[PDB]
């Protein structure tokens, strides 16, 4: 004879929070009057690992200068020369978008980041001082996962 029974087997699956970041160094930079050229692709950032739905406002690149909307690079020599950069990217429609940088967005509306990874470009602005003569920044990339 055949005898039967049943039970509902159960499983719990969990989604860790993975954040990755790749930095690809841009060309070396050229002093022209003591100006560097504007829109110099300083470097390309690729943020990855995040869950689809992660937004641009949940990403905040911060540094010690704390200048809202700009990352500040400073000379390693003792002379304290400085220039500012912006962090910007493109959405699926090719519109201009930005993460927060020191807590504020430079350009665009809040958007959902591209699936998988999102490129951001670090682009030079200028230096409100003037004459630039290694320049360094230490940047924290904070992602506030949904």
């Amino acid at each position: 004879a055949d005898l039967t029974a049943s039970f509902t087997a159960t499983a719990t699956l969990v989604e860790p929070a993975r954040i990755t970041l790749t930095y690809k160094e841009g060309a070396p930079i050229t002093i022209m009057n003591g100006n560097i050229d504007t829109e110099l692709l300083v470097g390309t950032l690729t943020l990855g690992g995040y869950k689809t739905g992660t937004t641009s406002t949940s990403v905040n690149f911060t540094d010690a200068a704390g200048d809202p909307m700009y990352l500040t690079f400073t000379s390693q020599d003792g002379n304290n020369h400085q220039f500012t950069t912006k962090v910007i990217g493109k959405d699926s429609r090719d519109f201009d978008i930005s993460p927060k940088v020191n807590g504020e967005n430079l350009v665009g509306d809040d958007v959902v980041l591209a699936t998988g990874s999102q490129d951001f470009f670090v682009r030079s602005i200028g230096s409100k001082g003037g004459k630039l003569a290694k320049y360094t920044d230490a940047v924290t990339v904070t992602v506030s996962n949904q």
Binding site: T12, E15, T140, Q146
Partner: protein, 199 residues
Amino acid sequence: SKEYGVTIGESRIIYPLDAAGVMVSVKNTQDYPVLIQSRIYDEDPFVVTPPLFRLDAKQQNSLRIAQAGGVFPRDKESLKWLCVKGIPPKGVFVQFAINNCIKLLVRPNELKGTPIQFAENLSWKVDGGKLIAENPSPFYMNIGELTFGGKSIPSHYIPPKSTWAFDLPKGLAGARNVSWRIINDQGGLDRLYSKNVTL
């Protein structure tokens, strides 16, 4: 080129109010050792142990999160952020550090049910160019997918027994159809709910 990465073993922490502690895994996914620095922020009753420790290449370790004291509403969830930063070892040079932050959801045992049981109950309205959600439940409703008039809207949590207003892109003139999924306690995108806005 240069590579960075911090993995937390979950994307949220559900912390039962008054519990001794919880554990969460942290993984250094890189080929160099880092310092793991962990901090709690408001939206120090909660203590992270160890607050700072070394984690070698491709190694995993666990933090304890423990509540010592503190006072929280018992009619509602509270929200904190656990932030986990991987500090790497020390003409343009830049060093990065990933600060990976996840919601720490403080849940009274006094609360009945779970979020996925009340996710349908969100109600929606357009006022002053914004899509406004009302959350009558005592849980944070962590929206992970939101669409209005067939257009994607960057999501955000709706706090307990409260509201959140979302900015709308252009072209949603007389749009009424809202769709949403919350993120469940385990970090998964939950079921699709669909509803018309009211006046």
